[PDB]
Structure 1
């Protein structure tokens, strides 16, 4: 571009929007939820994967992946909700935190207990 033009109208940075409407400089939010489905992914993969409609405390209805092997979650249940997209499913940008609030940890899991909410085995 020409230097007189840049004096006249300057350069302008991109908006750089976030991936999560949960936002608000928050890592964690809360919600009361409603419905737990098991929906198919996109055709390159196959499975039935556990997904929940979380009504957030700030009034936003969003959808969220349930990790780990099974869960206790149903109906009205208060869970913790962190970020992170799952690309194989449609539009899920969030994950529920296992072993928090109303959520069970994954029983009989032994490795990687930083995820899945499992206190260390003692014998």
Structure 2
């Protein structure tokens, strides 16, 4: 309060906690799926979310979401994860880059193809 108090001890700002610690400020990371399982969402939402638990290159193990309808992911799959947050999935703060070196694009996706690694249909 008093300037004398600020002199005796200055104002310490609030450092921000990163909501994607496993990324280490890297835009993406590479990991291997150690387990693929179906989870349930928060009370407003009902579904069988397809998620995978992934052992990362930097030693971290985290659960990642798999967008789009269907996946070819299994055990021992080298996927690439990206930052993000799933509201209804508690403890899931990472997505999987559909189309990144093990996970293929979504089949017959026609709109927002770039968000799922679906090349432009030949037409």
* TM-score, normalised via structure 2 length: 0.96
Please state how far the C-alpha of 1:35 moved relative to its aligned partner. Answer: 1.0
Report the 3-state secondary structure (helix = DSSP H, G, I; strand = E; otherwise coil) of the residue aligned with 2:6.
Answer: helix
Aligned length: 123
How far apart are 1:89 and its partner, in Å? 1.0
- The root-mean-square deviation of aligned C-alpha atoms, in Å, is 0.9
Contact 2:23 2:29 in 1 (8 A): no
Kindly provide the CA deviation profile for residues 33-67 of structure 1, in whole angstroms up to 9, marking residues without a partner as x.
Answer: 11111111111110111010000011111001010
- CA–CA distance in 2 between the matches of 1:27 and 1:5? 42
1:12 alignment partner, SS class: coil
Residue 119 (1) aligns with residue 119 (2): yes
Instruction: Provide the secondary structure at the position in 2 that maps to 1:34.
Output: strand
Alignment partner of 1:114: what SS?
Answer: helix
8 Å contact kept, 2:23–2:83: no
User: CA offset at residue 24 of structure 1?
Assistant: 2.4
Structure 1 residues 82-105: Cα deviation after superposition (integer angstroms, max 9, x where no partner): 011101012100000001111110
**Greater Cα shift, 16-25 or 100-109:** 16-25
Q: Could you say which structure has the higher strand fraction? A: 2
Cα separation, 1, equivalents of 2:8 and 2:120? 64
Relative to its length, the structure with more helix (as a share) is: 2
Unaligned stretches of 5+ residues in structure 1: none
